[PDB]
Every structure is written in structure tokens, then in C-alpha cells.
Symmetry: D2
Subunit: 426 residues, 4 copies
């Protein structure tokens, strides 16, 4: 039955989220601010915060009970993500990115993959996982007929899969010391045999695990950071341009065989679309809160309070309205992904809707709040610039809206089985 | 606990709504279409349909069980309103307006007001009710200090209240024969004693009941239609410019005494704000459905299916995303209004949000699908033009966004007790 | 030398436009309102107006001096169109549609075509022209490799061309008495010899003249009015669904040989794009004027003038700003089309820009003004609803923004010779 | 005569602007980039290239011919500003800000003021001027009845004016060495006698010159930089929070006596509004060019060029359209400000319009281009982030759109003399 009240457990999640952001993430921010904005040392300095998160069981919660994890719901994740993004986006993302890295494992792992999950179930240390998908040259057209396909390839040679390629933007993939993370899910193209004339490129896509142990065993030059990328927000996040060279792994490392990889990757990106929605809600909440606090304490030298000016008030209420719509849609999507109604195609349309709606609304909200607050918002002592520069990544990352998210919505509607309102009216 | 599944009762509401719309409303439209677009004969011709709806208990459903009715939840009203607006907005509104007319009684009735509700609990005939608020000269500033205030006044003379003034836009107020509807809740300004220097005009606002009976007793010309207004949509809806001249009623007709009328009127308007949200969702659904249908069956003489144009698909998926957000927000507001969490001030901000967001989103969606369908959509054989001309009213009526709904949002934020997210997180 | 001042002549053009609109167009409106909105005899009552326009040399002005006319500049046309659309769009469009019909003749006519312009150069009566290009099944994809192409076809049987096809939306094509207009440029597909395998469907496109004399000559059944298309705006304009059956004409009637018709059609559409911009400017001007007028006389019962409300004033000034941008862009495109400094590609990018910017701005302006004016704008006694219903056609007619106008912009930019700012800086 | 062709003198200005930007501004950028992002040394490091611009005659060009300068038309200024902003906004703004500082003197100088202008007319050194208006507490309400008014005050004590107050954001006011620029136009309120009951605060507003020589004469503590403000773009621009303490100047230093200052300051801001339009155009051009460059050399791993994606193309053409409207509007305002037709009030409206339209269109263009380019736009190696962070200042600076520019538009429309289209057709 239609209910917007948090359960006692969901309220616990909210309170826990508040404490995590306040006690772990805020100190992480003061810590990385001690290094210049283009320094990879920002990322490295967050390792002790990450460890503290690990000790509190965050990584265990990112693994499904099927695999021995404690795993929660997308709804609970959405609540956590909103709160963290309202406080400290960059340090939070490093943690959420490990969750993304572990998602393909939740979706496709079998019993033989348990050994790979062990470091993450330990409840100690600071292991990092990464979903290693994107490439320097772009991947919006990795599955397009007539195109080159993924640049990163795997070849079965004897009893070993051999990986070669360059990747970029894959959060966490280089690990704390830039020599490779604990567990990478590398999305690549099987090239043991050539793509046949007219064959669907998706038939060749795999996901193969690569651990830090694999890289070490393969020795010098097997993994290399080609370029650290400085970004205008998320300054403690590390997703460098990297290269894998002749990285040989055992057959047990294959997660998704050729022809099953794309589906699992997009499956992982469906879940994260929901949390990108939550990211947007969190930034919008932070923007509204900061603008409202500005108004309530600063009348800009006027004869009346700032909120008594219709033009200012209407900008703020506009943001509040979009934020409330964004959270409702995000929760609807989080609920539907795990409960229906509607088949998977219908559930996924909502996750994509949340992603697209909230990411763009977050950018618009940030720009509106800047105009409302006025010239003061150009002062970097105030939070407004960082908010905007955090928001603008939402539409373009986790599968950009223009080149990926919207192309999928197109394919969904094209299907004969498309049933517009099934995700609502059963 | 966060849940978006419809209960059995909510599924039932939805099924009954589909039935009502297809079986009663659609025929009402075939009937009124036979009269000229700008003729009050359209409204008059809907009486048979209306009475049939009365026979199915629709009016009983607009009255709270506390007063003898079968009224349900705001959530169920949202589901009903969405479906009716997706099929036939004009015939639907005349019915919903009686519901609005009855709301102030549902909210503030005393034991002595039971007799006034009798015709509406009868289950037969075709009694009309009206919330009579708007006036030819505007009402956004009715409560504004230094302004004239309501043009409609009532003054206590002996043992009868005497009502004088002109109203406009008040749906149903003139009844089927244009000589006065069964039950009108007349909002007006006590003028028995003058507003005192600097006194809050809200102190004088009353709601007085006026029945067809009262009007008949008052004789020749106590009620007069001064002008029938022709509208581009809602053509079977009747809310003329009218005048009450020396309408004398017994003290039992007072629903809200001077200084209590404003709060009750605005309380009614908070509930209706949620349902305007639902109206917006329903038009959006109708526009998306019609556009999708067209696209599935006309490739515009193209070499591929219409949906295969990035540009066309993007307009439609844009509408879908906005509609899902609009419904999610509407249901959240519907739920919160009756369940919290948060102050009434908190709950209220969400109802206003739904009104503003969905009304404007409805107009955008209709504009978008017109562009997507193309030149064909100027063709009055298709539903698109009437969709737009219906949607355009949503932002301006039931308290316009610009001068009323946003002014209320402004005032809520201005309160020292404003607590932004209490309506979600407590 | 950059100059926005009207020359003496251009001021003359503007005064003439003002006079035409005030003395001819306004009365045409009061006149055609006497007849039904979906009736084609509303259209017939506008003849005296058209004939007065003809008397004043308007039609001679639509023909270039090369072909014996008194043709002016695109800038003067933009001035005229803006004024007319700010007053009376429907009656005005009948006149302008003749200008469009005549345009391919201005672009493509040779010595042998002089005979066809005679009725338009005589300064007598009320001859109508029409560019008959649009078909029931759409035409955005008539030029596309794989599609059924134009459904209207012409084939060379001996020494006469035989034309068969159905048409729609072609303003003016059926004449005053509905038996066919004086002069139609029929755009069609050469079905004399089948299109070759893998051949650009453009190669078979023609334009062929068809006079009322030709229709009369082919006798009964040669021209038939199938369906009259009712539209929400332009209610006095007649552009029905018609069929040409075995319409036989001499080889002199060919204006554009197979393979040349597409370029000339789009050439004509470039010119009109600029004028669609002017239409948009005109509607925006009227919307702003009406809203401003409303505000200066009606304070909506407020304690202060309506323009003292920030939210209201910002809506109005937003419209004023867009209108000024719209006109400045329209004039730039009008100037560049005939004067450079672009090459033809650069020039038409600006014409398309004007069409897209102003059409969309007009729709947005009409929506904004309705919200600003409020509930009063739903009253058909006021001009706001009609304004919206006219503007909504601008993005979709004369080559919709979505399936053609932007498709051409894309092709322009794809050319290796594209030089972004050459239309301004050389 | 409506003409969009540049004259030989305007072509000359364009060519000189290209050369100046490339030779002076680009090297300024490579120079200041050697210092940290937030360092005041970025500003200081631009002195040598500022001196080169001075030697090139740039400051002479900011002074009106009436004072011995070679200042040209606003149109030519708009051409220069667009080019400079398309190349290097930050170093450009420092130069343009000296022009703003000289503007009140161009507008109001008396014979006694020629000595103050002398340093700026020599063609050597690197003199800086500042219009010192803005204050930490805000200034949108400096003229509001019932408000505190400017915090910066001046009092006549004998034969000297004594100035006290804090200013913030006033570009260049602190000079190269942070101890005060060469020539500051300080906007302040006369506090010699108190404001009378219900008196217009405008009556007390003055502009008083303050030179570095004045500051040195007044001794230690008379001028102090309180805080250098770090900004997300314009990182070489210095407009710190500063304090003037008991700064005494002779009466010759008074530029606008009490009651004349506000009109001159706003006069300066009317001219600057046009040039902000041009800054907007320049950033839009730069964003469009950078995205087109990326598209023409990077197909994102596709089977077709990036421009063949309808999605990408539609985003770029949208930016191109807005840019053409922006420039057209800016040039119209430039021309009308100096040539009419219309009142000063009418001309003024167009300047305000260009500022509001173009500033907001620049922000929208930058966000659109980021979405089109995709994740690559988040890489600080590419120009898109810096473009956005430059663009967001435009709506909020030089008199913010929400608090100032739109309030001026509102006051214009409120005048009985308002004549909507006089600046076009008057
Ligand atoms: C902070 C951060 C964290 C990230 N996390 C990860 C991660 O954990 N793992 C990972 O693998 N990657 C990660 N990424 C990368 C991110 O997911 C990107 O969205 C991904 O690289 C795809 O980028 P894109 O959508 O721009 O596609 P691209 O291929 O780069 O396309 C770019 C643009 O080209 C256009 N385009 C291309 N093809 C088409 C088409 N067919 N139709 C229409 N338009 C088209 C679109 O306009 C699109 O916006 C991260 C990036 C950042 C900045
Ligand atoms: C189909 C239909 C059904 C209706 N049903 C009913 C009904 O059942 N009962 C009833 O009483 N009425 C009814 N109405 C009227 C409807 O409720 C209107 O919204 C109501 O009259 C208020 O209109 P408004 O908001 O435009 O206020 P107005 O006072 O008309 O204000 C108009 C505009 O002025 C501007 N404005 C005025 N004051 C301010 C301010 N202080 N600040 C900023 N801007 C301001 C705003 O832009 C506002 O939009 C109906 C109307 C229609 C068309
Ligand atoms: C008042 C009025 C006057 C008119 N006057 C004339 C006239 O004088 N002469 C004449 O010939 N016609 C006339 N027309 C019709 C006008 O020329 C139409 O614009 C023309 O028929 C093309 O319509 P369209 O752009 O909707 O294209 P259509 O082919 O009808 O398609 C419409 C929609 O299909 C989608 N679409 C189709 N293909 C694509 C694609 N490849 N990419 C993206 N989207 C696509 C687009 O979203 C587009 O909006 C008139 C119409 C009106 C209303
Ligand atoms: C790079 C840069 C260069 C600059 N150059 C100069 C310079 O050379 N000289 C100089 O003096 N300053 C300069 N400034 C400051 C600039 O001119 C600002 O626009 C100015 O300080 C006014 O800011 P504001 O419009 O936000 O007004 P504020 O008073 O700061 O108002 C802030 C916000 O409050 C709200 N508000 C306040 N009052 C009202 C109201 N009455 N109605 C509605 N809303 C209201 C509005 O949303 C407004 O945006 C510069 C600033 C920067 C960043
Ligand atoms: Mg009045
Ligand atoms: Mg203060």
C-alpha cells in the first residue's frame, strides 16, 4: 500500500548515514584540503577515513547475503547516498565506487568467485574495488556495429586469459598506491576469435576479474598510470587514465563469458542510476539549505528580510519543489527495482528516469541558488561553487544522459512488450 | 515503510475510476460536443451524465464518513482524478467542483449543518455544490493589508445575514438552470462593523452557506448571471460572472464566523492543490499515450520507425520522465497531507509543490508532444490541441501559481518554525 | 556600417504595414467571426480584405523585379509580417501564403513562365497562389533513402505531364470557390522512370505549376476537396486535404525538372524561415502589449499596482527581453540571406536559427503571459488563448524544427567547409 | 538603413582585437598559471602584460574624445570585448575594469578633473582605475527607503571630505601592490547631515575620487586589504574586501555631489551592461568552438562522426542559435544606446536586456556543451569547466540579474512614459 513513512529500520539507516557523514566524511574533507586541488595526494589522504568506513561494516553491506554479505536495499542505499552527498560528495564517492565495483559480482558471481570477495567480507583493512568500463577514446559506441569496439581486449592463450588495454575514469582502479586496486571488474572484448561479418559486437563482451595479486604476479609494467586527471569537483576521487599490459589471469578469473558481459555491466549501471538520482537529491538539499541559511541571516542591506523579495523567494521555492519531486521519483525507482510492479524493462525505465531527472535538476538547482544568493556565491569561502562543480558530473558520468541513458530509454519504448504505466498500475 | 504497491482498495479505486471515465464521462463528451463550443448549453447538457454518477455514489464519496458519506483518502482521490483527467477533463471537473464545494463543510461543519448535506447524501437527483471564492476583480490580494479586500460582503441585520457582491469563475455556482446551485459556500468579508485601523483583514473573512432554497425565498433578482465566460478548454464547465443582491439568510447558514473563513477556505485549497497535481499527471499520461500511439503507427513516411530518431524519442522519454516525477510527488503530497510526518505547515508545502510542479509540467508536456508529433498535431481530429488547452488552466486556476501558490510557499519559508525536510525525515 | 535604424523607405514599409493591419486586417477579423470556426466559409468572408491588399500592390511586391514585380527585401517583409501577426495572424497568412507559392517562381522561373504571373501582376481582383508540398503521410522523410517518397506523383506521357496525388496543409490551394486556386506550385515525384537501386531519391523531385485554367480544362474529378482540416489557430485560413486526379499539363508547366525541385523547395523554405521568425516576433509583441495593458489598468484588487509585484514584472520583462532578441536575430538573418557575408550555407544557418529561436520563444512567451495575467487569460473575450494557439503552430509548420530544420543544421555543420562565424565576421 | 555589415573601421577593430587577445592575453594566462589557483600573485603577475596593453593604446580607448581620449562606439567596444572573452576572460576583465572605473569620469568630469585622467592618457606605465561601488553587506538595496543605505560614508569637515567604509568586489581597487589603485571612483553616502524623515536616500549619494597619492598622503592605516577573495574563475582578477579609514580629500576630488552620484553610477552600469552582453557572446563562441573542435576530431569510438549523432548535433546547434541571438541583441543595444531611437529610458531597457539575456544564455551554453562533450568535459585539461566557472559570474556581477537588473526593468515598465517599442520603431 502507498506509504512514504520510513520504517524503524529505514530511520536507523538515515541516522547512521547522518553520523557517517558528520563523523567520517567531514574530517576527511578537512584532511584532503591540506593538499592542492590537483594533487593525487587528496585521494591518498582519505584512506584512513575509508578504513573507518570499512570497520563500520560499509563494504559488507555492499555484498549480497547470497554471497555472504550483509547487503541492504536500494531504498536504504538511496537514503545513505543523499545524506552523504548533502555533506561531502568526494570522499563518499570513493566508498560508493567500491560498491559499484562489487555490483557485477553480486549480479553474476558463482560459488567459484567466493575467494575474490574475501578481503571485502573481512570487516577490516581498506580494500578497493572498481568497475573498469570506460576508456580514453570513449565507450558510448562500444556495442555499435561497424565501430572499433572496446579497445581493451582479452585473449585465451593456453589456460590463461590475457588482457591488454587502456582504461580511464574507472574510480578506484589504481588502488591506494597507484599500482592497482584489490579487485577490478574489467569490461573487455574477447578477441580470441575475430568478430564475424555482421555479428553483433555485444556477442564478444566479457567481464574478467583482475586482483592486485594478479598484477603483482604478472610483474613490472603490467599496470601503469598514464595520467592522473584533475577534476573541478570530486577532487579526492581517483579514476586515472591507466594501461594493462599482457595481464595473464587463470580461467577462474572470468566473471562473465563472452556475450554476457554487456548485460551485467548495464545491470550494474541500472542500480547506480538510482543512486545517481540520490546524489542529485543530496546536492539539491545542500544547495537549498545553504541558500535558505544565507537568506535567514543576511538581508543584503534591505529594509526587509531577503525572503520577502518575491524574485528571491521564487528561486528558492522552485529548488525546493524540484528536490521534493526528485526524491519521490528516486524512491519510486529504488522501490520498483527490487519490488515491481512491471518486468525488468519497466523497472529499469524508472531507474533511468531518476538518473536523468535528478542529475539535471541538481545542475539547474545549483545555478538557480547562485543567482538567488548573488555575487556572494562567487566567493569560494561559501559552498555554492563546489556544489555546482559537483553537480555537473551527474548528467555525464555513470553513463552520460545524452549518449547512453537516453539511447536506452529509446530502445525500451521500441519494444513490442513496452507497457507505459506497468511500473505503477501493475 | 516505503512502499509504492497499490493496496486492494487502491486497485479498486483505480478500476472504478477507469469504469466511471469510460462509461459516464466519455458519453458526456459525445453529448456536449453536439452543442456550440462557446455555449452554456454544453454544461447544461451534462446533467444526465452527472445524475448517473450521483446514482453510482460519486457525491456520497465526496463526503467524509464523519458526516454520513463514504469519503476515502486523498491518495485514492489522486488516483481517481488522474484517470478521469486522462480521459475527459471537462465533464470530470464539474463533478470534482461539487467535491470542492463540499470540502469546507467536511472541514468545519457543525451539528446544524447536517441538513445542508442531505441532498448530497441522497444518492439521487443531480445536486450541484460550489466553493464560491473568486471575484471579477481578482482575489490574490483579498487578505492584503491596505487593499480593498473581498468585494463580496455580508452584514448582520437583526437575525439574518445579508449578502452582497459579485463572484466569477466559481464552478457550478449558477446551477443547471443558471438561477442558483443547490449549495454554495460563499466566502466573503464581514462588514457589520468596519475593519479597524491596521487590523488584519483575515479577521473579517467568513464562509456563509447559500442554498437554492434561500435564493428562491429571496425572490426576483436576488441572483443573476451577468456573463457566461467561454473558455478554450473545460467547455462544459460553468463558472459565470454572477451577482448576489441582498441575499438574506438565517444565522444557521454561517459555516465560518468572521475570522475563521480564510483558514478553512485555504485548507480546502490545500487538498485541491494535491488533486490539481493529479489532474496534471492525467493530462501528461494522456499526451504521452496519444504520442506513443501515433509513433507506433506512423513512421512519417520514413526509412526507419519514428522512435528511431534520437530527436523524436528524446521528446517522448522527456515527457515520460516528467510524468513519473509528477505522480511520485503528487502521491507523496497526498500521503503526507493525511499522515505526515511534519507540522501542517510542513505537509502543506508539499501539496503546494505538487500543484505548481505538475500544473506547469503538464503544459510543457503538451507543448513537447505537439512538437514531436509535428504538423499533424495542429489537426483538430487529434487530441493534442484540446490537451494543451486543458493543461493551460492548471497553473492559473485553483489559486494561480504566480500570485497565490508561490506567495504561500514564500510565507511558509519565512516562518521561524520552517523546517525544510521534516515532511520527509521528521 | 552596423545600423539598426530604418531607412526612410523602411519607415514607409512599416507605416504601410500598420495601415494595412489596422484598416484591412482588423475588420477582416470582425467579419469572419460571423461564421463557424471549423467552417471554410469563415475563410470566404476574407475576400474583400485580400482584394484590398491586392489593390494596394501587395501581390506585385511578392514578385521580383526580374519577373516584372515590385519585389522588396526580406527585411521589409519581416517588418510587414511582424506588424500583421501582432494584429491578425489568420487573415494575414492567406496573403503571405500566396507569397510563398510565388517564391519558387522567383527562384526558378525562366522566360517561358511569364504567362503564369500575369494574374498576379495585373493588380486586379484576388488571385491566390500556393506552394503545394505537404501530404497526409508527412514529408520530413520523402527525401530519405528507403522510404515510399512523395505520394503525389507526376509522369511524362508523350508531351504532357500527368499528375496524381493527395495533398494537405497547402494554404490557399483550393481557391475561393473550392474548385482550385489560380496558381499552385505542386512539389512531386517523377514516376516516369522508376528510381534506380541505391539512388538518392532527391533526383526524382520536381515542381510543376497547375493553374485553375488547367483544372477547368481537365474537367470534373480532376480536383477534389476530400477533407477540410480544422485548426486551433489561423481559423480563417483554408488548406484542406485535396486530391489531384489525372491532372494533365503541357511541358511548359514544369518549373523544376526532376532533380532540381528539392533545392528550390528548401530555398523557398529558407526565405520563409526568416518570416516565421517575424511571425514569432509579432505574436510576442502582441502578447507583451496585452499583458502590459492589462497590468496598467487592473491591479487585481491589490494595494499596489500589478507591476510592483516582482514575480509579475519579471514574467513581463522576460518576454520583452526574448522579443528584442527574436527581432534582432530575425533582422540579422533577413539581412544576411540577401547580403552575406556568409556563403549560402552560412546564410541559411541564420535563417533556420531565426525560425527555431523565434517560434519556440513565441510559444514560451504566450505561456508566460498567461501565467502572469492569471485566470483572466482563460477568458476567450481576452486575446491570450488565441495568441498561444497561433504560436504553437510556428515550430511545426513550414518545416518543423525537430524533423527538418535541425536536421539541416546538422548537415550544415557536418560540411568540411562549415565556417561558424563567417556570417558575421567574414 | 538596417545593415549588419561591419564598416572598414569595425573590421579594423575586430582584427586588432584578435591580435591583442592572441599577443597580450594568451601570454598573461601562461604567466599567471605558474602561481597557485587562489594566489593574489596571479593578479600581480599580469602587470607586465597590462603595461603592454597600455602601450598599445587600450586605456586611451577607454576615455571619451571629450576628455582627450580616443574612445569609440559601444559597438566597437562590444567587438573587442567578445573577442577578448572568447580567448582569455580573466586577464581581459582586469583591463576592462579600468574602463569601468573611468566611466563615471567620462560621464561627469568637470574642468578640475582633467589632472586625474592624465596618467591614463600617457600611453605608458600601468595605471589602474576602479569603480568602487560594491560592499560586503550587499548593495542591491542601497537606495531603498527604510534601509541602512551604503555603509561607506563621506562627511565634509572644513575644506576636506572624509571617507570611511568597507568595500568588496571592486575590481582593481587595491592596485598592483595592494595599497590602493591609481584612481578609484568611490560611491558613498553623504553623512554630513542626516537623512530627513521620509527623504529619498538617493539624495545623499555621491561619487568621490580617491587617488593613490591621496592614500599615501593620508598615511598608514588609511587603506587596508582585509581579505583576498578566491573565485572559481577570473583567478587573476583582484576585487578584495578592503577598508578606507578617515581618508581625507580636497573638494576638487568630488565628482558627483550628493544627490547626483546614483544617476552617474547607474549610467556607468548601463554602458557596462552592453559589454556584459558581449562577454556572454564571447564565452558562448568559445564554448561552441571548443565543442565543435572536439566533435570534428573525436567520434567517441563510433561508426560515424560525432556530429552525426542527432543528440550531439542538436545540443551544438542550440548553442549556435542562442549565440547568434545574443550577439544580435548585444549589437542592437550597443547601437540604440548611442543612436536611439527612443528616450534614454527606452535605450536603457535594451542595455539591461542584453546583459540579462546574454549572461544567462552563456551559463546555459556552457552546461549544454558539457553534456554534449560528455565525461571528457570534467577533465581540467580541457577548457569546458573553466568556461562554465567564468560564465556563472555574468548573471551575478555588474549588478546581479535578480536583485538589480530586473528591478530596473520593473521600474522602467512602471513609468507612465514607458513606450514599449520606441527603441525600435520610435
Ligand atoms: C567522478 C567520475 C567517476 C566515474 N566512475 C566510473 C567508474 O566507476 N567506472 C567506469 O568505468 N567509468 C566511470 N566514470 C566514467 C563515466 O561513467 C562516463 O559516463 C563514461 O566514461 C561514459 O562517458 P560518456 O557518457 O560521455 O560517453 P562518451 O563515449 O565519452 O560520449 C561522450 C558524448 O558523446 C556523445 N555521443 C557519443 N555517442 C553517442 C551516440 N551514440 N548517440 C548520441 N550521442 C553520442 C554524447 O553527447 C556523449 O555525451 C567516472 C567518471 C567520473 C568523472
Ligand atoms: C475552469 C475553472 C474553474 C474554477 N473553479 C473555481 C471554483 O470552483 N471556485 C472559485 O472560487 N474559483 C474558481 N476558479 C478560479 C480560480 O480558482 C483562480 O485561480 C482564482 O480566481 C485566482 O486567480 P489568480 O490566481 O489568477 O488570481 P488573480 O487575483 O486573478 O491574479 C492574477 C495574476 O495577477 C498577478 N498577481 C496578483 N497579485 C499578485 C501578488 N500579490 N504577487 C504576485 N503576483 C500577483 C499574478 O501573476 C496572478 O497570476 C476557476 C477558474 C476556472 C477557469
Ligand atoms: C498554418 C499552416 C500552413 C501551412 N502552409 C503550407 C504550405 O503553404 N505548403 C506546404 O507544402 N505545407 C504547408 N504547411 C505544412 C508545413 O509545411 C509542415 O511543416 C510540413 O508538412 C512538414 O511538417 P513536419 O515538420 O511536422 O514534418 P512531418 O514529416 O509531418 O513530421 C512531423 C514530426 O515527425 C518527426 N520526424 C520525422 N522525421 C524525422 C527525422 N528524420 N528526424 C527527427 N524527427 C523526425 C519530427 O519530430 C517532426 O516534428 C502548413 C501547415 C500549417 C499548420
Ligand atoms: C569578478 C567580479 C568583478 C566585479 N567588478 C566590480 C567592480 O568593478 N566594481 C564594483 O563595485 N563591484 C564589482 N563586482 C561586484 C558586482 O558588481 C556585483 O554584481 C554587485 O556587488 C551586486 O551584487 P548583487 O547583484 O548580488 O547584489 P546583492 O546586494 O549582493 O544581492 C544579492 C542577492 O540578493 C537578492 N536580492 C537582494 N535585494 C533584492 C531585491 N531588492 N529584490 C530581489 N532580490 C534581491 C538577489 O537575488 C541578489 O542576487 C564584481 C564582482 C566580481 C565577482
Ligand atoms: Mg479592480
Ligand atoms: Mg548586513
Amino acid at each position: 500500500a502507498i506509504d512514504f513513512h520510513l520504517s524503524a529500520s529505514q530511520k536507523g539507516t538515515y541516522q547512521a548515514a547522518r553520523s557517517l557523514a558528520r563523523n567520517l566524511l567531514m574530517p576527511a574533507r578537512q584532511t584532503y584540503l591540506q593538499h592542492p586541488p590537483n594533487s593525487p595526494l587528496r585521494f591518498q589522504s582519505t584512506q584512513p577515513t575509508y578504513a573507518a568506513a570499512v570497520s563500520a561494516g560499509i563494504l559488507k553491506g555492499q555484498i549480497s547475503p547470497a554471497h555472504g554479505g550483509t547487503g541492504g536495499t536500494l531504498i536504504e542505499s538511496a537514503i545513505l547516498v543523499e545524506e552523504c552527498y548533502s555533506v561531502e560528495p568526494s570522499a563518499a564517492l570513493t566508498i560508493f565506487a567500491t560498491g559499484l565495483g562489487l555490483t557485477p559480482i553480486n549480479l553474476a558471481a558463482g560459488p567459484q568467485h567466493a575467494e575474490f570477495l574475501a578481503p571485502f567480507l573481512s570487516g577490516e583493512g581498506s580494500p578497493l574495488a572498481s568497475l573498469v568500463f570506460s576508456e580514453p577514446g570513449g565507450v558510448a559506441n562500444a556495442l555499435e556495429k561497424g565501430a572499433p569496439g572496446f579497445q581493451t581486449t582479452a585473449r585465451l592463450e593456453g589456460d590463461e586469459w590475457v588482457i591488454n588495454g587502456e582504461k580511464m575514469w574507472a574510480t578506484n582502479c589504481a588502488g591506494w598506491d597507484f599500482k592497482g586496486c584489490d579487485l577490478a571488474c574489467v569490461v573487455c572484448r574477447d578477441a580470441t576469435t575475430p568478430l564475424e561479418e555482421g555479428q553483433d559486437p555485444e556477442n564478444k563482451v566479457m567481464i574478467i576479474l583482475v586482483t592486485r595479486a594478479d598484477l603483482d604476479r604478472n610483474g613490472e609494467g603490467s599496470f601503469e598510470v598514464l595520467r592522473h586527471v584533475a577534476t573541478p569537483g570530486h577532487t579526492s576521487v581517483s579514476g586515472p587514465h591507466v594501461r594493462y599490459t599482457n595481464v595473464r589471469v587463470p580461467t577462474k578469473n572470468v566473471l562473465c563469458p563472452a556475450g554476457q558481459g554487456a548485460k551485467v555491466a548495464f545491470g550494474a549501471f541500472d542500480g547506480s542510476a538510482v543512486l545517481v538520482g540520490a546524489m542529485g537529491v543530496g546536492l539539491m538539499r545542500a544547495a537549498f539549505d545553504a541558500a535558505l541559511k544565507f537568506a535567514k541571516e543576511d538581508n543584503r542591506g534591505g529594509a526587509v528580510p531577503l525572503l520577502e523579495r518575491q524574485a528571491f523567494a521564487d528561486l528558492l521555492s522552485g529548488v525546493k519543489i524540484q528536490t521534493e519531486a526528485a526524491r519521490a521519483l528516486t524512491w519510486k525507482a529504488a522501490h520498483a527495482m527490487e519490488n515491481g510492479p512491471g518486468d525488468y524493462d519497466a523497472r529499469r525505465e524508472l531507474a533511468l528516469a531518476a538518473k536523468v531527472f535528478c542529475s539535471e535538476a541538481a545542475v539547474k538547482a545549483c545555478t538557480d541558488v547562485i543567482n538567488a544568493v548573488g555575487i556572494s556565491a562567487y566567493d569560494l569561502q561559501r559552498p555554492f561553487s563546489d556544489l555546482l562543480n559537483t553537480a555537473v558530473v551527474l548528467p555525464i558520468f555513470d553513463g552520460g544522459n545524452v549518449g547512453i541513458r537516453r539511447r536506452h530509454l529509446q530502445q525500451l519504448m521500441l519494444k513490442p512488450t513496452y507497457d507505459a504505466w506497468s511500473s505503477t498500475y501493475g
